[PDB]
Design a protein around this ligand. Structure first.
Ligand SMILES: Cc1ncc(COP(=O)(O)O)c(CN[C@@H](CCCNC(N)=[NH2+])C(=O)O)c1O
Ligand SMILES: Cc1ncc(COP(=O)(O)O)c(CN[C@@H](CCCNC(N)=[NH2+])C(=O)O)c1O
Lengths: 380, 380
């Protein structure tokens, strides 16, 4: 068999998800039960039972496309592609968009699949450093100097998994001005767009009707990672260009899943709202906890989404092999029943992803486990 | 956008599926409603409602893997990979199995995705001609002469979409003897294995616990193309080797869909049986119809599955541009409301796929439409 290393993030979860743990590691809000979905999204059993289990269509079912378009594409259902998670939307669209030798600017520490496709296509990749994004804007000098005339694409995820850094409306305006000026295609992964802490929720660039590619998903802010539904918003020409690859990989989605997805999107405010309130309660708690532990841990406060990247000063002050944070997280898990994702999953060897979108009581228990672990290490 | 021609089969359906037609074109049995699935497969609403919409796992949920393994993998759930249709199982496994320069024997006129992956990987492809398969066996001289020492893989689909040709137990034994003798990996697409007309249902090679790769799906004999669930049976080492690609494309399936899939597989005999009886009734009808139209159409009688490839003598006797059968099918559709798939989808320019797994009454109407069309063309 052809050997390739799996991404660190997904391998970590294959090995360490399990029973009797405090999972404070996710970039998403905790999942709804199907019961709760039927209640909130008003899905009578009769509506499900009526679905004929036949083929759907290559672009995604019209009903689910329309629901997504009304929210993120300015009402244009022709500019939505409905996929098996946003994972599939990324794979399909980046395969069609990116060409060998294209110059592409990619955010530092971006979700693995977004970093993979430009490499695989043989693009000339330039990295936009994380430090260049602060207070809601990309540093103007860096923006102008990295995104240059003839750049093919700029690929970003805001709010950012795992740091929670995001843009303000002004910051996004400036980014769109520069991609317009240079002819670059903005590729905008908006997985966690619906939860913003510092500024307002950012309008999807896909609503403009131009040459941008946007992603979203039900996995991170809707409580539906296990529905496996995401999307791209992009010009129809790009979306139809994905069909040859879709025809040899997934064909199309299930009409049963598409019914549930349409209803979820139509009730987005309810699904997101309940979970976002819980996430905000946990973030308040986390803010105090971080302050109380400032001698041992530092961070950038998250500005959007439901996770952050605390940095453990012990790992920096020694600056050990980058594997050290993996061993830290393994020991935290085994001794204190508490799960983070080691920063090696995100190109951040001194930090770990800490999620605050999970249930409140378990979140506090996870924080207690980590506090005890940190104290043990500081002492002795 | 990167331009590639979509496969003829999938483009044909994007353009021509619609209301008020007699669809006698499918390689599958007609779909169940979700109501019927809940009834037959004994799925109470409470069981669905209890599903937490969280992540599943890279190999496929344990319950669905076990149900599939008991049927096709000799009980070994570790040798099953559960995927989004068999389309995904093919893409994942062939990506991992096939290397540049590997010698691969591929059945003539094989489903497009199975033909694509060896080409894409840069394999040295040799074609096993359709004529070499007859009366349940590959011609011994051709088998020995094409599948040679050091051949990496032999890729076949039996029963065959679209001709319905298949092997007997003896034929499959001989094929397995030769792959064993040469060290080749048999790649066995068993999408339509459960419906056999001439010999018994063929045991899945995956049940042996050796180095073979098998595919199956709920799409063609279970009435569940819209559930989007298939599988590979293969050595676990190959299956785990697919994870890096799965991690950047689909991640995993929905636990809700996996519950339904497990129950469907456990009730396979009931789901398949009802539909197979209907298909056999239609095949009897089709056999008489073919005999009555023998001056205008010829075929190999299907030996398995639920479709056949009638050949229109008019297209052979003139041997026109291969596009002619597409125009034939377009005209049949518009004038007589009857859908076939043109043989250009299967490398068979003088024939068209005619499916007999659909509803009985519509099937007769489709045959009437085609009979009238053929008579019109013969006359004038
Ligand atoms: C930023 C971003 N973009 C896309 C995706 C893809 O998720 P889907 O929409 O396909 O669901 C993601 C997902 N990231 C998470 C993946 C977790 C996988 N689960 C398990 N069990 N391994 C994550 O970061 O954990 C993000 O983030
Ligand atoms: C032989 C074979 N192997 C795999 C597949 C893949 O189907 P899934 O398991 O992923 O469902 C197939 C499927 N073939 C059919 C595809 C029809 C697509 N539907 C539409 N609307 N385009 C087909 O031959 O029609 C086969 O056959």
């Amino acid at each position: 068999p052809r050997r390739e290393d799996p991404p660190v993030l997904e391998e970590w979860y294959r090995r360490h998800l399990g029973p009797d743990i405090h999972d404070i590691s996710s970039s998403g809000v905790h999942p709804y039960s199907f019961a709760e979905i039927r209640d909130v999204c008003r899905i009578p059993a009769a509506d499900l039972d009526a679905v004929v289990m036949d083929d759907s269509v290559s672009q995604g079912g019209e009903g689910v496309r329309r629901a997504i378009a009304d929210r993120y594409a300015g009402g244009d259902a022709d500019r939505v592609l409905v996929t098996h998670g946003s994972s599939e939307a990324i794979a399909l669209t980046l395969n069609a968009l990116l060409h060998r030798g294209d110059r592409v600017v990619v955010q530092e520490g971006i979700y693995h699949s977004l970093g993979h496709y430009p490499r695989a296509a043989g693009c000339d990749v330039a990295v936009l450093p994380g430090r260049a994004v602060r207070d809601g804007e990309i540093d103007p000098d860096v923006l102008a100097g990295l995104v240059t005339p003839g750049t093919a694409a700029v690929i970003v995820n805001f709010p950012h998994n795992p740091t929670g850094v995001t843009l303000s409306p002004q910051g996004l305006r400036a980014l769109k001005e520069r991609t317009a000026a240079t002819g670059a295609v903005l590729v905008w992964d908006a997985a966690t767009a619906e939860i913003a802490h510092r500024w307002e929720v950012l309008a999807d660039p896909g609503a403009d009707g131009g040459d941008t590619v946007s992603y979203g998903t039900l996995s991170k802010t809707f409580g539906l990672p296990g529905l496996r539904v995401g999307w791209a918003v992009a010009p129809k020409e790009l979306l139809t260009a994905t069909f040859p690859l879709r025809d040899r990989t997934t064909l199309f989605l299930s009409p049963l899943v598409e019914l549930v997805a349409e209803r979820a999107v139509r009730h987005a405010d309810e699904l997101i709202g309940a979970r976002a309130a819980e996430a905000r309660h946990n973030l308040a708690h986390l803010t105090g906890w971080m302050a109380a532990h400032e001698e041992l841990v530092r961070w950038t406060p998250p500005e959007g989404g439901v996770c952050a990247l605390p940095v453990f000063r012990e790992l920096e002050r020694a600056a050990a092999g980058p594997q050290e944070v993996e061993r830290f997280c393994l020991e935290l898990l085994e001794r204190h029943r508490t799960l983070l994702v080691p920063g090696t999953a995100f190109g951040a060897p001194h930090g770990a992803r800490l999620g605050f979108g999970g249930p409140q009581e378990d979140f506090r228990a996870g924080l207690d486990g980590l506090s005890r672990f940190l104290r043990e290490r500081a002492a002795g």
